[PDB]
From Swiss-Prot:
This is Cysteine-rich PDZ-binding protein. Disulfide bonds: none annotated. Component of the minor spliceosome. Within this complex, interacts with RNF113A, as well as with SF3B1/SF3b155, SF3B2/SF3b145 and PHF5A/SF3b14b. Interacts with DLG4 and TUBB1. Interacts strongly with the PDZ3 domain of members of the DLG4 family. Associates with microtubules. As a component of the minor spliceosome, involved in the splicing of U12-type introns in pre-mRNAs. Involved in the cytoskeletal anchoring of DLG4 in excitatory synapses. Expressed in striatum, cortex, midbrain, Purkinje cells of the cerebellum, pyramidal neurons of the hippocampus and neuropil. Expressed in heart, brain, lung, liver, kidney and testis. Signal peptide: none annotated. Belongs to the CRIPT family. It comes from the Eukaryota. Residues 2-8 are annotated as: Sufficient for interaction with DLG4. Residues 5-8 are annotated as: PDZ3-binding. It is found in: Cytoplasm; Synapse; Cell projection, Dendritic spine. The chain holds residues 94 to 101 of 101 of the full protein.
Amino acid sequence: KNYKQFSV
């Protein structure tokens, strides 16, 4: 959904 998820 144009979604993005990142670990920081």
